[PDB]
Symmetry: C5
Subunit: 221 residues, 5 copies
C-alpha cells in the first residue's frame, strides 16, 4: 500500500520550495508498533532521570501515552499517508470572488520546545475552475499543523498546498496563534499572540484583493 | 393557474446562467402526498436498517416527519410555486445610494450531506427605477436557502434573482455561515465559518462602492 | 399666525424635490378634536369586528387612545405645525470640518403596515456660515420619523431638510433600523436590520469625505 | 495678555482668530469672594422664586456651593491664571511619527443651558523640535473644557492652543461627548452623542496622515 | 566575558542615533552590593522624613526591597549584561510577509516620576535573510522596558534594536500604555492612554504596508 495522487503533487511542490519539514530518508520501514515501544522506553528513562516513581498507577502508563501521542497523533502530519482525501467540483457557478473560511481550529507544536501552539487560521481563495469542499480546507490546515512546526513555515506550507490543489495562485492564508513556549515558559508573556500570513497571486499583487482579505482577518465568534 | 411572472423571469435567468439547482425534468406531476408516503416508507426502511424500534411511540412517526420535512419545508425552494410574491414601488425618492439589509436569518442544507447550514446573509442594491419591499429581500434569501445547497452557488442565485427583479446589476450578496458537515461531523471544527460574496455591477466595477459594502458586511446584533 | 419661516422653506423644498409625504389636497380644516373622535369611531368598529369586548374596563379606552396616538403623537410629523424651532449661531469658529451626531433615537412607523419601526440615526454636516443647535438635528430627525414611513424616503427627507436649514448640501444622514413588519410578522426575521444612507454635497462628491463619514457607523440595540 | 509666557502666547493666539470665549473686559478687579457673595445672593433669589425651603438644613448651603462651583470650579478655565504649567523636552530622539493620547476625560458645560457635557477627547500631534509631557495634553483639554461651552469651539480652542505650545500645525483634536441639554432635557435623547474634530497641518492636508488619526479615533 | 556581540551592536547602534538612555561614566566605581545598601540608606532616610515608623516589622525590610528593585529589577535594562540571548534561523522558507507579534506585556517606569507604566506593545517585521525566535521579540521589548523611560524614546529603541538585530529596516513598533503619573496622580485621568508608533523601511515609505500594520494594531485578548 502506497500514497495518493494529490498527496504526491503537494509534497513535491513543498520540496521544490524547501518548505518541507526537515526529515531524513526513512531507509527501512521500521515496524511502527516497534517505533513507539522504543520511544516509550526513552520516555521512561527521562522520567527516571527526573526521579518520578513510575510504580505509581498514574505515571505508569504515561511513558506509553507520550509515545502514542508523538507517533499516531500530534505529528501525523509528518506522514503523507494521512493526507486528507481531497474533492473538488467544477466551478460551474463561475464563482469569481473569494471564498473565505475563518477561525479554523488550528492545534500545533513549536518544534523548538515540543510545546503547544493554540491558534486560529483564516484561509481564502478565488475559485478558478474548481470549488473545493469546505471541510478539505480545514483538514488541510490541521494536517500541516500536526508536525513539529514554525508558524512562519506552517503558514507557507498551507498556502502552496492549497494553491497546488485548487489549481490557482490566488490563495491567502493567515494564522493567528499563542505559543506556549512563549507563554507557559521562558519570558512567560501571558497576553501576546503571533500572526503570520502568506498571500498568493492577486492576494499579493492586487492591492484591492490584498486589503479585502486582510481586512476580514482576525475574528472572534 | 401555472406559476408567477417574477418567478418565471428568475427561473429563466438562472437557467440561462447554469445557476439552477441541478434538477431533472419532473416528467409527470406525481401527486404530492404520494411522494411523502414513498419517502416516508424509504425512511422507515433506513431506520430499520439502523436497528431502531419503530414500535416505540417516538420514532414511530419520524419517517412521516422527515418526509414532510424534505418535501414541504426545508426544500420548498425547489418548487417555484413557493416563490415569494414580489412587490415594488416607483423610486420617486430618487434614491441613488445603496440600501442594505444585514443579518438576514438564513437557514439551509448542504446538498453534500443533507445537513443544517446555519447562516446570516447581507444584501445590498442601488435602486434604479423601483424599490423592493424590504421583507421581500429576506424572503428571497430564504427561498433559495430552502434547498439542498452549496453556499458558493446559493450566493450567486440570490444575486442574479435580485438583479432581475430590481432591474439593476448593482446588487451585492454576502453570506456568513456555519456548516454542520464541518462542525458536527468529520473534521469536527467547532469554530470555523465560511463566507462567500457575489458582487454586481458597481459593487464590482467601482472600487469605491465595492468596499463601502464590504466594510459594512459582517455584524453582530 | 400661520407657520414658521423654516418649516415653510423645508416643506417647500421637499415638495419641489418630490420627497414630501404622500398627502392628499387639503379638503377642509377639520377641528383636531373632531378627527380624533372620528378615528376612535373607526377603531371602535375595528375592535368590535375583532370580537373584542370594549365593555372590559381595559380595552374601553383603546379607541380613544389609538386616536390620540395617531393624531397627536406617532404621526404628528405630517403636521408642520409641529416643526421644531430651529436656532443657529454664526460660524465665527470657522469650523471647516464635519460635525457628527451618531446614535440619534429614531422611532417611526412603516406605512405598508402601520407597525413599529425602531432605529438609530447618524447625521453629519460641514458648517457653512451657520452652526445648528445640536438637539435640533435630533428633533428634525424625530419630526420626519413620526409619520407613516419608508426608510428610504425618510432618510432622503432628513437630508434635504438639513441642507435647507443649514444652507449647505454638505450633509449626510444614515439610518439603521429594525422593521417590526419584517420581524413581528410575515417572514418574521428576528435578526435582520436595514441601513439606508443619503449623502449630500462633499459627502458624495469628495471620495475622501464620504469614507470619513461612512466609516464612523454601527452602534445601537 | 494675562499671567504667563505660555498662557499669554495662547490667549493672544486665540483672540487672533475669534476663538476666545465671548468675554467683556473685566474693567476693575472686584474681590473674588465679593462675587461669590453676590452670585450666591442671586441664586438664593432664584431658589426662593422657586418656592424652595432654604430654611431647611440642606438647600441652605446650596446657594454658596453653586456660587463656589461657578467661580472656583466648573468655569476655572476662563481665568488663564489657571492655565496649566507647560513643560516640554527637546526631541532628541527625533520622533517623526504621531503620538496619540486617547480617552482623555473631558467635562464641560454647554453655554446654552449650563448643564453637564460629558465627553472623551483624543489628541495626536507630530513632534517638531519639542515633545510635551503627556499629562500636559490631558491638562490642556480640561482647561478649555472648564468654561461654558460649545463643543465645536472647544475643539477649536484645544487645537490652536496646542499647536502654539508645541510650535507646529500638525495637531489633531477629536471630541466625542454627550450633552445633557439633549439627554435629561428637551428632546431628551438618551442615546445620541456628538463627535466634533479639528484637524491641522498634515492631519488636514496629507490624506494618509489625516486618516491614520481618524481610524484610531473613538475607543472604549 | 564583557557583553554579547548583539548586545554590543545594539548598544552602539543606539548611541550612534542618540537613543541611549541618558547615563554617566561612573566617576567613583563600586560594588553592586554596596550600591543597594547606599540606596537603601537613602530610602530609609526618605521614609523617616515621611515620619514612617521603620520600627514596624513591616516597613523595616522596605528600603532594602526598594533597593533591590531599582538595581536588579525595574531597571535591569540599563545594564547590557541582561540583554537577551538572541537566536535566528536562516529564512530558508523565504518569508517575504510581515510576521506580527501583538499584545506583548510591557512593564516600564516613567523617568519623570519613577511610577509604573502599564502597556501593551505590538511588533512586526518582514524577514529579510533571517527569522528571529518569537519570544526574543517579547524579550527585546521588556529589556528596554525596564529603565526609567519616555514612551516616545522607548518605542524608538525597540525599533532600532530590532532593525539592527534582524538586519533589516522593515520593522514597526507600536506601544499603547497607561502612565500612572497621569492616572494615579496630578491631573488623575483614570481613562486616558498614550499610543506611540515607530515605522522603519516599508512601514514608513510603503503606504500599502504602512496601513496593513496600523490596522492590525491595538487588540484585546
Ligand atoms: N465548496 C462547498 N463544499 C461543501 C459545501 N458543503 C459541504 N461541502 C463539502 O463537500 C465535501 C464532501 O466530499 P466527500 O468527498 O464525500 O468527502 P467526505 O468524507 O464526505 O468529507 P469530510 O468528511 O467532510 O471531509 C466536504 O469537503 C464538505 O465539507 C458547500 O456549501 N460548499
Ligand atoms: N519565528 C518562530 N520562532 C519560534 C517559533 N517557536 C518557538 N520560536 C522561538 O525560538 C526560540 C528558542 O531559541 P533558543 O535559542 O533555544 O533559546 P531559548 O532558551 O529557548 O529562549 P526563550 O524561549 O526566550 O527562553 C525562542 O525565541 C522562541 O520563542 C516559531 O514557530 N517561529
Ligand atoms: N451647535 C451646538 N448646538 C448646541 C450646543 N449646545 C446646545 N446646543 C443647541 O442649542 C439649542 C437650544 O436652543 P433654544 O432656542 O433655547 O431651544 P430649546 O427649547 O432649548 O430647544 P431644545 O434644545 O431642542 O430643547 C438646541 O438645539 C441644543 O441642542 C453646542 O455645543 N453646539
Ligand atoms: N423599501 C421598504 N419596504 C418597506 C418598508 N416598510 C415595509 N416595507 C415592505 O413593503 C412590503 C408590503 O408589500 P405587500 O405587497 O403588501 O406584501 P405583504 O404580504 O404585506 O408583506 P410580506 O408579508 O412581508 O411579504 C413588504 O415587503 C414590507 O417589508 C420600508 O420602509 N422600505
Ligand atoms: N512625552 C512624555 N511625557 C511623559 C512621559 N512620562 C511622564 N511624562 C510627563 O512629564 C511631565 C512631568 O513634567 P513636570 O514639568 O515636572 O510637571 P509635573 O508637575 O511633575 O507633572 P503634572 O503634575 O502631571 O503636570 C508630565 O507632563 C508627565 O505626564 C513619557 O513617556 N513621555
Amino acid at each position: 500500500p502506497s500514497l495518493s495522487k494529490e498527496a504526491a503533487l503537494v509534497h513535491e511542490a513543498l520540496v521544490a520550495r524547501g518548505l518541507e519539514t526537515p526529515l531524513r530518508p526513512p531507509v527501512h520501514e521500521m515496524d511502527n508498533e516497534t517505533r513507539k515501544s522504543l520511544i516509550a522506553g526513552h520516555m521512561t528513562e527521562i522520567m527516571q532521570l527526573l526521579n518520578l516513581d513510575l510504580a505509581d498507577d498514574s505515571l505508569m502508563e504515561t511513558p506509553h501515552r507520550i509515545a502514542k501521542m508523538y507517533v499516531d497523533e500530534i505529528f501525523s502530519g509528518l506522514d503523507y499517508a494521512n493526507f486528507p482525501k481531497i474533492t473538488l467540483i467544477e466551478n460551474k457557478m463561475k464563482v469569481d470572488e473569494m471564498v473565505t473560511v475563518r477561525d479554523i481550529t488550528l492545534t500545533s507544536t513549536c518544534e523548538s520546545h515540543f510545546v503547544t501552539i493554540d491558534g486560529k487560521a483564516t484561509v481564502a481563495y478565488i475559485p478558478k475552475d474548481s470549488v473545493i469542499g469546505l471541510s478539505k480546507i480545514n483538514r488541510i490546515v490541521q494536517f500541516f499543523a500536526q508536525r513539529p512546526q514554525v508558524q512562519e513555515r506552517l503558514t507557507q506550507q498551507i498556502l502552496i498546498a492549497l494553491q497546488t490543489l485548487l489549481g490557482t495562485n490566488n490563495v491567502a492564508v493567515s494564522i493567528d496563534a499563542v505559543h506556549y513556549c512563549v507563554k507557559a515558559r521562558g519570558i512567560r508573556d501571558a497576553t501576546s499572540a503571533t500572526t503570520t500570513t502568506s498571500l498568493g497571486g492577486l492576494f499579493k499583487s492586487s492591492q484591492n484583493t490584498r486589503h479585502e482579505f486582510l481586512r476580514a482577518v482576525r475574528h472572534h465568534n
